[PDB]
């Protein structure tokens, strides 16, 4: 689960993407419809960042 | 191609030529037949394509010193 652990099953990093991308990236672009923040150039907050979670889903240790 | 499967005889480049000064191409084609042989290591008959000069070798050498060592990898015969 956490980066201090070793050789855990890699499949749980797909739930990290559920929490950290699927429940985040659309709300980041849709909160403008609730009058909140309204800026568009914000996708760096999941772009390049969540790639490290996918790199860890594609990991062979513990699989 | 008319291949002698028991020796690898193929057709060859060559000219007809006669008592004429004009010379024209021929390309020598074989005569082509079939023959059936027994393989004592596989206890079955097999049919192979054969030709002049080539069919003269196998009967002379013997199948136990020709056909019994003919496979390069298997050739599905």
């Amino acid at each position: 689960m956490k980066a201090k652990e070793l050789r855990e099953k890699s499949v749980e990093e797909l739930n990290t993407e559920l929490l950290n991308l699927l429940r985040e990236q659309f709300n980041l672009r849709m909160q403008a419809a609730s009058g909140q923040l309204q800026q568009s150039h914000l996708l760096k907050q999941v772009r390049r960042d969540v790639a490290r979670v996918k790199t860890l889903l594609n990991e062979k240790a513990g699989a | 191609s008319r291949v002698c499967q028991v020796t690898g005889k193929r057709p060859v480049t060559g000219n007809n030529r006669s008592h004429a000064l004009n010379a024209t191409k021929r390309r020598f084609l074989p005569n082509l037949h079939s023959h059936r042989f027994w393989v004592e290591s596989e206890k079955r008959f097999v049919t192979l394509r054969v030709s002049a000069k080539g069919m003269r070798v196998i009967d002379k050498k013997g199948i136990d010193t020709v056909l019994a060592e003919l496979r390069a990898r298997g050739e599905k015969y």
Partner: protein, 93 residues
């Protein structure tokens, strides 16, 4: 399962339509942006999973070509999709 939440990467920013947004965006019907697959079945799942309201109607279409986008080069809008969502009793998404 059946049906998993792993597909709900769908939807982008709000969009505008003279056919809905300009009278219904806060009361019954809203228009949104999408990727190259508009994910027609999962649009309403992504609304139910974010705003907890039931959906009554979903349309997506595809808009094609449309001339000029540069003052010195060739440019188009080409093939692009939308999402048009009507709510069952929800108002303001």
């Amino acid at each position: 399962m059946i049906r998993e939440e792993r597909l709900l990467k769908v939807l982008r920013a709000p969009h505008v339509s003279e056919k809905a947004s300009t009278a219904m965006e806060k009361s019954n019907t809203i228009v949104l942006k999408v990727a190259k697959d508009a994910t027609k079945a999962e649009i309403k799942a992504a609304v139910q999973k974010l705003f907890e309201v039931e959906v009554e109607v979903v349309n997506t279409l595809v808009v094609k070509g449309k001339v000029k986008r540069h003052g010195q080069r060739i440019g188009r809008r080409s093939d692009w999709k939308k999402a048009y969502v009507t709510l069952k009793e929800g108002q303001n998404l």
